[PDB]
Amino acid sequence: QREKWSSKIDFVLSVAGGFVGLGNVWRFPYLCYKNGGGAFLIPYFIFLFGSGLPVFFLEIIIGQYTSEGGITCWEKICPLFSGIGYASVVIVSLLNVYYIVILAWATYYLFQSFQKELPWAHCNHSWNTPHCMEDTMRKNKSTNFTSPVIEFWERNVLSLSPGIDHPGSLKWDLALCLLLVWLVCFFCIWKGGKVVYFTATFPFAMLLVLLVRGLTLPGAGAGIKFYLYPDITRLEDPQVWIDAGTQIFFSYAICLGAMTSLGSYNKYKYNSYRDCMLLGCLNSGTSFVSGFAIFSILGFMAQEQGVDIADVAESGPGLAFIAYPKAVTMMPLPTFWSILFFIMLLLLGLDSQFVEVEGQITSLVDLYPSFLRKGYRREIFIAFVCSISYLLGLTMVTEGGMYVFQLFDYYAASGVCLLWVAFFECFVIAWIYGGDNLYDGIEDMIGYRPGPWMKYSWAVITPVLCVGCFIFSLVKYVPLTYNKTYVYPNWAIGLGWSLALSSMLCVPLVIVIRLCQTEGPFLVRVKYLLTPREPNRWAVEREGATPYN
Ligand SMILES: [Cl-]
Ligand code: NA
């Protein structure tokens, strides 16, 4: 009874809009700048060509073959590890909490651009500290200054607190912006062409404009050089490897249960290998090229401020909110380009949020189709999920909430919680299910048996990379720090560990539940739970699909 796309273009557009966005223009530059720059790229490419792309194609193929969402697909493929799907849902749930907060910030920035003079271009505003000085005069002539862009980002937008211990009050403006963005998402998903042909083209046009401005900026060679040339000693730090590996999985929206849902509506006989490789190349190119735009602007900022290239902005989240607003003021008619850039950011975030929330809602409804979809209950369930995600998301809107955002960024829907899923998705498919059986299924679907790249990537490369990163992170533990200065308390790291474990522990918990529920000897129960029960029964009966095995 699964739906099918139309003309096969809707699927491509949905995928492209779902796995490109804030993870390419916001998270990637800030992670690259936090890890030293060029040293971040080598693990990025190692996890990009040995994994990430194969895992993305695996999720798409699982969705298309099983014709099931993010949960039932693993029930069909391997019942015993069905909890993997549950874990994915948990991850996306947490991702739906903090990933939209960024849009609120963007919305606030947009609501700040409607005035004649951009508020982040002078130090004479009320919120500025006496240490604020204009960057042009900062180079000339117990002595520290703060750039007006960073002053606006910290004092006005974030209203940052001494620490996560002090949350302060709720920022009414940011809370209203978050509520507006949640209302937009809920109205779009609940109830809702050539219009969409310009909602995935304009962001790329603005990216091109930013690229041009950054490249033509004076003193941008230092920024490009900091971005490219790597450092071996930083490659010897496990933090770079784990950050790059988890950025690869975050950007491609894998281990979330969303890409599987997107692929579930594909036709059974549809060459999704090319359509999943071209889009993956587009996503990687978007990230890599936007890195140039961010780092050329950072190099110009460092040249004009007279400071180090790595000491001109925030190592944590908000680099895109300190760098791009600076280059915006360097272009003629700064207000026009500020509005355009923040509209681009809003589009890139809203499309991804729509895709992720749609995947989560589809996966949750598939559990109880006759109760949570029958009648009018679907609307009520979507409203309840959005309201809960909004209320649980107001903890990052308070004055001391920015730190909470980082706790969600580093641990929830990232970090080892991704690896834990990525190891299990590839282990079940390659070893328990069988790489050759899935290759036969792919040969039946796309028309030709692929090369040995996918099989080796699922079997050897991805599990080894995930377990090596896990072991390296555990052996050499670097506690999470905000902007290289803040030290989270014990309970903050405990909360981050709890957020990670909430999704991580779903895989063994469901295994235990299945083992206890099944009767007979343990060996018999394991054999029963490790046997896929008609993985493509719907595809076999509906279409002319060949039976599994
Ligand atoms: Cl990326
Ligand atoms: Na992405």
Question: How far apart are the CA of 539 and the centre of ligand 1, in A?
Answer: 33
> What b/e string do you get for 347-386 counting C-beta neighbours within 10 Å, with b at 16 or more?
bbbbbbbbbbbbbbbbbbbbeeeeebeeeeeeeebbeebb
Closest ligand (CA of 52): 1
Distance CA 396, CA 408 (A): 9
Burial of 441 (0-12, 13-18, 19+ CB in 10 A): buried
Question: How far apart are the CA of 287 and the centre of ligand 2, in A?
Answer: 8
With a CB cutoff of 8 Å and minimum separation 6, the contacts of 323 are 29, 294, 297, 298, 301, 313
Question: How far apart are the CA of 374 and the centre of ligand 2, in A?
Answer: 34
Asked if residue 245 lies in contact with residue 47, where contact means CB atoms within 8 angstroms, the answer is: yes
Task: Give residue numbers after which the chain breaks (C–N above 2.5 Å).
Answer: 141, 192
Distance CA 52, CA 249 (A): 6
Resolution (A): 3.3
Closest ligand (CA of 258): 2
Closest ligand (CA of 351): 2
The secondary structure of 307-347 as a DSSP string is S-TTSSS-SSTTSTTTSHHHHHTTSSSHHHHHHHHHHHHHH
Question: How far apart are the CA of 22 and the centre of ligand 2, in A?
Answer: 7
Closest ligand (CA of 15): 2
Question: How far apart are the CA of 410 and the centre of ligand 2, in A?
Answer: 16
> What Rg value do the Cα atoms of the chain yield, rounded?
24
Phi then psi for 482, rounded to 5 degrees? -95, 120
| C-alpha dihedral sign at 53, 56, 62, 65 | negative
One-letter amino acid of 387? S
Q: Show the tokens assigned to 526.
A: 């394991």
| C-alpha dihedral sign at 29, 34, 38, 40 | negative
Distance CA 277, CA 283 (A): 10
Closest ligand (CA of 44): 1
* HSE-up of residue 473 (Cα within 13 Å, Cβ side): 22
Assign 398 to helix, strand or coil. strand
* HSE-up of residue 18 (Cα within 13 Å, Cβ side): 26
With a CB cutoff of 8 Å and minimum separation 6, the contacts of 162 are 400
Asked if residue 127 lies in contact with residue 155, where contact means CB atoms within 8 angstroms, the answer is: yes
DSSP-derived secondary structure letter, 67: T
Helix or strand holding residue 486 (H, E): strand 486-487
Q: Show the tokens assigned to 391.
A: 């209320």
CA-based diameter of the chain, in Å?
A: 82
Question: How far apart are the CA of 283 and the centre of ligand 1, in A?
Answer: 7
Question: How far apart are the CA of 393 and the centre of ligand 2, in A?
Answer: 21
Question: How far apart are the CA of 18 and the centre of ligand 1, in A?
Answer: 13
Asked if residue 378 lies in contact with residue 372, where contact means CB atoms within 8 angstroms, the answer is: yes
Question: How far apart are the CA of 109 and the centre of ligand 2, in A?
Answer: 22
Question: How far apart are the CA of 248 and the centre of ligand 2, in A?
Answer: 8
Distance CA 362, CA 71 (A): 10
Question: How far apart are the CA of 513 and the centre of ligand 2, in A?
Answer: 34
Residue with structure tokens 């000339």? Answer: 140
Closest ligand (CA of 253): 2
CA 274 centroid distance within chain = 23
Distance CA 531, CA 76 (A): 9
With a CB cutoff of 8 Å and minimum separation 6, the contacts of 292 are 211, 214, 215, 224, 227
Question: How far apart are the CA of 206 and the centre of ligand 2, in A?
Answer: 17
CB under 5 Å of ion ligand 1: residues: 28, 251, 287
Cα separations in angstroms, 286 against 43, 97, 154, 240, 335: 17, 25, 28, 21, 25
Closest ligand (CA of 18): 2
Question: How far apart are the CA of 51 and the centre of ligand 1, in A?
Answer: 13
Question: How far apart are the CA of 410 and the centre of ligand 1, in A?
Answer: 16
Distance CA 183, CA 453 (A): 43
Question: How far apart are the CA of 546 and the centre of ligand 2, in A?
Answer: 34
Experimental determination approach used: cryo-EM
Question: How far apart are the CA of 290 and the centre of ligand 2, in A?
Answer: 12
Distance CA 229, CA 217 (A): 20
Question: How far apart are the CA of 142 and the centre of ligand 2, in A?
Answer: 42
Question: How far apart are the CA of 32 and the centre of ligand 2, in A?
Answer: 14
Helix or strand holding residue 481 (H, E): strand 481-482
- Kindly give the residue spans of alpha helices, DSSP state H, lying in 252-323: 259-264, 272-305
Asked if residue 497 lies in contact with residue 407, where contact means CB atoms within 8 angstroms, the answer is: no
Q: Show the tokens assigned to 194.
A: 């050539």
Phi then psi for 545, rounded to 5 degrees? -70, 145
Distance CA 525, CA 514 (A): 9
Closest ligand (CA of 56): 2
What's the topology of domain 9-542?
Amino acid/polyamine transporter I (1.20.1740)
* HSE-up of residue 84 (Cα within 13 Å, Cβ side): 29
Question: How far apart are the CA of 146 and the centre of ligand 1, in A?
Answer: 30
> What b/e string do you get for 265-275 counting C-beta neighbours within 10 Å, with b at 16 or more?
bbbbebebbeb
Q: Where are the domains of the chain?
A: 9-542
Asked if residue 23 lies in contact with residue 250, where contact means CB atoms within 8 angstroms, the answer is: yes
Question: How far apart are the CA of 280 and the centre of ligand 1, in A?
Answer: 10
Q: Show the tokens assigned to 85.
A: 């799907």
Q: Bridge partners of 132?
A: 146
Question: How far apart are the CA of 23 and the centre of ligand 2, in A?
Answer: 4
